[model samples]
Target: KVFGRCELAAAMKRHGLDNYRGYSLGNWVCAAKFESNFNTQATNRNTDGSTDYGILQINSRWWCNDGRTPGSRNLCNIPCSALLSSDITASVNCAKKIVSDGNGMNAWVAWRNRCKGTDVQAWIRGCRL
Candidate 1:
Protein backbone atom coordinates (compact mmCIF):
# COMPACT_ATOMS: atom_id res chain seq x y z
CA LYS A 1 0.00 0.00 0.00
CA VAL A 2 2.78 2.38 -0.85
CA PHE A 3 1.73 5.85 -2.19
CA GLY A 4 3.48 8.88 -3.65
CA ARG A 5 3.98 11.72 -1.13
CA CYS A 6 2.87 14.95 -2.85
CA GLU A 7 0.34 12.94 -4.76
CA LEU A 8 -1.45 11.94 -1.58
CA ALA A 9 -1.24 15.44 -0.21
CA ALA A 10 -2.79 16.91 -3.33
CA ALA A 11 -5.41 14.20 -3.33
CA MET A 12 -6.60 14.65 0.23
CA LYS A 13 -8.11 17.93 -0.85
CA ARG A 14 -10.99 16.10 -2.54
CA HIS A 15 -12.53 15.19 0.80
CA GLY A 16 -12.57 18.76 1.96
CA LEU A 17 -9.60 17.62 4.01
CA ASP A 18 -7.29 19.56 1.72
CA ASN A 19 -3.60 18.74 1.90
CA TYR A 20 -4.11 16.15 4.61
CA ARG A 21 -1.27 13.79 3.73
CA GLY A 22 -0.11 13.89 7.31
CA TYR A 23 -2.08 10.87 8.48
CA SER A 24 -0.97 7.22 8.67
CA LEU A 25 -1.50 4.66 5.86
CA GLY A 26 -3.94 2.63 7.90
CA ASN A 27 -5.75 5.80 8.74
CA TRP A 28 -5.62 7.37 5.30
CA VAL A 29 -6.27 4.15 3.44
CA CYS A 30 -9.10 3.42 5.79
CA ALA A 31 -10.50 6.81 5.00
CA ALA A 32 -9.91 6.25 1.30
CA LYS A 33 -11.80 2.98 1.26
CA PHE A 34 -14.50 4.71 3.17
CA GLU A 35 -14.43 7.76 0.96
CA SER A 36 -13.67 6.43 -2.54
CA ASN A 37 -11.07 3.67 -2.58
CA PHE A 38 -8.50 6.38 -3.02
CA ASN A 39 -9.65 6.62 -6.59
CA THR A 40 -7.45 8.85 -8.71
CA GLN A 41 -10.35 9.63 -10.99
CA ALA A 42 -13.29 9.79 -8.58
CA THR A 43 -15.67 12.64 -9.16
CA ASN A 44 -18.88 13.52 -7.37
CA ARG A 45 -20.01 16.53 -9.34
CA ASN A 46 -22.95 16.72 -6.99
CA THR A 47 -20.47 17.65 -4.30
CA ASP A 48 -17.60 20.09 -3.97
CA GLY A 49 -14.35 18.25 -3.37
CA SER A 50 -16.33 15.05 -3.73
CA THR A 51 -14.59 14.32 -7.01
CA ASP A 52 -11.17 13.09 -5.92
CA TYR A 53 -8.29 11.25 -7.49
CA GLY A 54 -5.35 9.05 -6.51
CA ILE A 55 -4.76 7.08 -3.31
CA LEU A 56 -5.80 9.97 -1.09
CA GLN A 57 -8.62 11.36 -3.21
CA ILE A 58 -6.82 14.38 -4.57
CA ASN A 59 -8.83 16.93 -6.53
CA SER A 60 -8.32 19.90 -8.88
CA ARG A 61 -4.65 19.83 -9.78
CA TRP A 62 -4.29 16.18 -8.95
CA TRP A 63 -2.05 15.17 -11.81
CA CYS A 64 0.70 17.68 -11.17
CA ASN A 65 3.02 15.03 -9.86
CA ASP A 66 2.07 12.35 -12.35
CA GLY A 67 3.33 14.22 -15.42
CA ARG A 68 6.69 15.12 -14.01
CA THR A 69 9.97 13.56 -15.18
CA PRO A 70 11.13 10.44 -13.34
CA GLY A 71 13.95 12.04 -11.34
CA SER A 72 12.30 15.30 -10.31
CA ARG A 73 10.19 14.35 -7.34
CA ASN A 74 8.34 17.32 -5.93
CA LEU A 75 9.96 18.05 -2.57
CA CYS A 76 6.66 19.12 -1.05
CA ASN A 77 7.33 18.25 2.58
CA ILE A 78 10.97 19.03 3.11
CA PRO A 79 12.37 17.45 6.32
CA CYS A 80 9.51 15.02 6.86
CA SER A 81 9.36 13.84 3.25
CA ALA A 82 11.23 10.83 4.57
CA LEU A 83 8.08 9.71 6.31
CA LEU A 84 6.15 9.74 3.04
CA SER A 85 9.08 8.18 1.21
CA SER A 86 8.90 5.26 3.60
CA ASP A 87 5.14 4.77 3.97
CA ILE A 88 1.83 6.36 4.98
CA THR A 89 3.00 6.37 8.60
CA ALA A 90 3.00 10.15 8.49
CA SER A 91 -0.58 10.25 7.19
CA VAL A 92 -1.47 7.90 10.03
CA ASN A 93 -0.01 10.43 12.42
CA CYS A 94 -2.45 12.98 11.01
CA ALA A 95 -5.25 10.52 11.57
CA LYS A 96 -4.02 10.08 15.10
CA LYS A 97 -4.30 13.80 15.63
CA ILE A 98 -7.85 13.86 14.29
CA VAL A 99 -8.93 10.87 16.35
CA SER A 100 -6.80 11.66 19.37
CA ASP A 101 -9.36 14.18 20.52
CA GLY A 102 -12.30 11.94 19.70
CA ASN A 103 -13.29 14.55 17.12
CA GLY A 104 -11.72 12.88 14.11
CA MET A 105 -15.13 11.72 13.07
CA ASN A 106 -15.96 15.37 12.62
CA ALA A 107 -13.17 15.54 10.12
CA TRP A 108 -14.69 12.54 8.38
CA VAL A 109 -18.07 14.18 8.29
CA ALA A 110 -16.47 17.24 6.87
CA TRP A 111 -14.99 15.11 4.12
CA ARG A 112 -18.42 13.97 3.09
CA ASN A 113 -19.15 17.44 1.77
CA ARG A 114 -16.42 16.94 -0.79
CA CYS A 115 -17.90 13.90 -2.51
CA LYS A 116 -21.41 12.61 -2.97
CA GLY A 117 -21.13 8.97 -3.95
CA THR A 118 -20.87 7.11 -0.65
CA ASP A 119 -20.17 7.28 3.04
CA VAL A 120 -16.89 5.39 3.27
CA GLN A 121 -14.92 7.98 5.16
CA ALA A 122 -17.64 7.73 7.74
CA TRP A 123 -16.57 4.18 8.47
CA ILE A 124 -12.84 4.82 8.32
CA ARG A 125 -12.99 7.94 10.45
CA GLY A 126 -14.89 5.93 13.08
CA CYS A 127 -11.80 4.40 14.65
CA ARG A 128 -11.37 5.19 18.36
CA LEU A 129 -9.01 8.04 18.99
Candidate 2:
Protein backbone atom coordinates (compact mmCIF):
# COMPACT_ATOMS: atom_id res chain seq x y z
CA LYS A 1 0.00 0.00 0.00
CA VAL A 2 1.28 3.43 -0.86
CA PHE A 3 -0.36 5.52 1.88
CA GLY A 4 -1.84 5.64 5.29
CA ARG A 5 -4.99 7.68 5.84
CA CYS A 6 -3.02 10.84 6.50
CA GLU A 7 -0.83 10.61 3.43
CA LEU A 8 -3.80 9.53 1.33
CA ALA A 9 -5.65 12.68 2.34
CA ALA A 10 -2.73 14.91 1.48
CA ALA A 11 -2.15 13.12 -1.79
CA MET A 12 -5.80 13.33 -2.70
CA LYS A 13 -5.76 17.03 -2.11
CA ARG A 14 -2.64 17.36 -4.22
CA HIS A 15 -4.25 15.30 -6.95
CA GLY A 16 -7.49 17.30 -6.71
CA LEU A 17 -9.54 14.35 -5.47
CA ASP A 18 -10.46 15.82 -2.11
CA ASN A 19 -13.85 16.80 -3.54
CA TYR A 20 -15.68 16.43 -6.78
CA ARG A 21 -19.34 16.32 -7.77
CA GLY A 22 -20.31 16.80 -4.13
CA TYR A 23 -18.52 13.68 -2.96
CA SER A 24 -16.38 14.54 0.05
CA LEU A 25 -12.83 13.60 0.90
CA GLY A 26 -14.10 11.20 3.52
CA ASN A 27 -16.10 9.36 0.91
CA TRP A 28 -13.08 8.85 -1.31
CA VAL A 29 -10.80 7.96 1.57
CA CYS A 30 -13.14 5.40 3.07
CA ALA A 31 -13.90 3.89 -0.29
CA ALA A 32 -10.25 3.57 -1.22
CA LYS A 33 -9.48 1.93 2.10
CA PHE A 34 -12.01 -0.80 1.66
CA GLU A 35 -11.34 -1.18 -2.03
CA SER A 36 -7.60 -1.69 -1.89
CA ASN A 37 -6.17 -0.49 1.37
CA PHE A 38 -4.56 2.33 -0.59
CA ASN A 39 -2.65 0.00 -2.86
CA THR A 40 -2.46 1.36 -6.36
CA GLN A 41 -1.60 -2.04 -7.82
CA ALA A 42 -4.60 -3.81 -6.41
CA THR A 43 -6.73 -5.82 -8.81
CA ASN A 44 -9.74 -7.97 -8.04
CA ARG A 45 -11.44 -10.39 -10.36
CA ASN A 46 -15.21 -10.36 -10.16
CA THR A 47 -17.52 -13.32 -10.51
CA ASP A 48 -18.96 -11.78 -13.63
CA GLY A 49 -15.56 -12.21 -15.29
CA SER A 50 -14.56 -8.57 -15.10
CA THR A 51 -11.91 -6.91 -12.96
CA ASP A 52 -11.60 -3.96 -10.62
CA TYR A 53 -8.70 -1.57 -10.94
CA GLY A 54 -6.57 0.24 -8.38
CA ILE A 55 -7.33 1.95 -5.09
CA LEU A 56 -10.87 2.97 -6.02
CA GLN A 57 -11.57 -0.44 -7.53
CA ILE A 58 -12.91 0.99 -10.76
CA ASN A 59 -14.63 -1.71 -12.76
CA SER A 60 -13.22 -2.72 -16.08
CA ARG A 61 -16.75 -3.39 -17.22
CA TRP A 62 -17.59 0.27 -17.29
CA TRP A 63 -14.85 2.72 -16.45
CA CYS A 64 -11.70 1.56 -18.19
CA ASN A 65 -10.39 -0.36 -21.13
CA ASP A 66 -8.42 -3.48 -20.34
CA GLY A 67 -7.61 -5.01 -23.68
CA ARG A 68 -8.85 -8.39 -22.49
CA THR A 69 -11.95 -7.16 -20.73
CA PRO A 70 -15.09 -6.93 -22.80
CA GLY A 71 -18.16 -4.72 -22.39
CA SER A 72 -16.11 -1.84 -21.15
CA ARG A 73 -17.67 1.58 -21.42
CA ASN A 74 -14.19 3.08 -21.28
CA LEU A 75 -15.71 6.20 -19.85
CA CYS A 76 -12.36 7.38 -18.56
CA ASN A 77 -10.71 6.58 -21.86
CA ILE A 78 -7.78 5.09 -19.99
CA PRO A 79 -6.23 1.68 -20.03
CA CYS A 80 -6.84 -0.29 -16.86
CA SER A 81 -3.08 -0.72 -16.50
CA ALA A 82 -2.78 3.01 -16.08
CA LEU A 83 -4.65 2.74 -12.84
CA LEU A 84 -2.26 0.14 -11.45
CA SER A 85 0.58 2.48 -10.75
CA SER A 86 2.27 4.31 -7.92
CA ASP A 87 1.08 7.55 -9.48
CA ILE A 88 -2.69 7.77 -9.02
CA THR A 89 -3.34 10.77 -11.24
CA ALA A 90 -5.25 8.73 -13.82
CA SER A 91 -7.31 6.94 -11.21
CA VAL A 92 -8.20 10.09 -9.36
CA ASN A 93 -9.13 11.95 -12.51
CA CYS A 94 -11.20 9.02 -13.69
CA ALA A 95 -12.95 8.89 -10.35
CA LYS A 96 -13.86 12.56 -10.66
CA LYS A 97 -15.24 11.92 -14.10
CA ILE A 98 -17.18 8.95 -12.83
CA VAL A 99 -18.70 10.98 -10.03
CA SER A 100 -19.60 13.73 -12.49
CA ASP A 101 -21.46 11.18 -14.59
CA GLY A 102 -23.98 11.02 -11.73
CA ASN A 103 -22.60 7.83 -10.19
CA GLY A 104 -21.22 9.66 -7.20
CA MET A 105 -19.03 7.43 -5.03
CA ASN A 106 -21.69 4.80 -5.39
CA ALA A 107 -19.86 3.72 -8.49
CA TRP A 108 -17.60 1.88 -6.05
CA VAL A 109 -19.23 -1.02 -4.27
CA ALA A 110 -16.72 -0.49 -1.48
CA TRP A 111 -18.19 2.96 -0.89
CA ARG A 112 -21.75 1.70 -0.87
CA ASN A 113 -21.08 -1.43 1.15
CA ARG A 114 -18.52 -0.06 3.57
CA CYS A 115 -18.61 3.72 3.64
CA LYS A 116 -22.11 4.93 2.79
CA GLY A 117 -23.74 6.62 5.76
CA THR A 118 -21.05 5.34 8.05
CA ASP A 119 -18.73 7.30 10.32
CA VAL A 120 -16.51 8.28 7.48
CA GLN A 121 -14.48 10.65 9.61
CA ALA A 122 -12.65 7.64 10.96
CA TRP A 123 -11.09 7.22 7.60
CA ILE A 124 -9.11 10.38 8.16
CA ARG A 125 -9.27 10.71 11.92
CA GLY A 126 -5.54 11.02 12.49
CA CYS A 127 -4.82 12.91 9.32
CA ARG A 128 -3.89 16.53 9.86
CA LEU A 129 -4.68 17.32 6.27
lDDT of 2 by residue, 52-121 (tens): 9898888888889987676557889999999998888898988888888775777788789989999987
Give TM-scores for every candidate, taking all chains together and pairing residue i with residue i: 0.30, 0.91
Considering summed lDDT, which 10 consecutive residues are worst modelled in model 1? 74-83
On TM-score, the leading prediction is: 2
Model 1 regions lying over 4 Å from their true place:
1-30, 39-86, 110-129
Which pairs clash in model 2? none
Instruction: Give the per-residue lDDT of model 1 (tens digit) for 13-90.
Output: 343353343343334444555454444333332143222333333322222233323332322222222222324443
Candidate 1: lDDT over CA atoms?
0.38
Error of 1 at 22 (Å): 20
lDDT of each: 0.38, 0.84
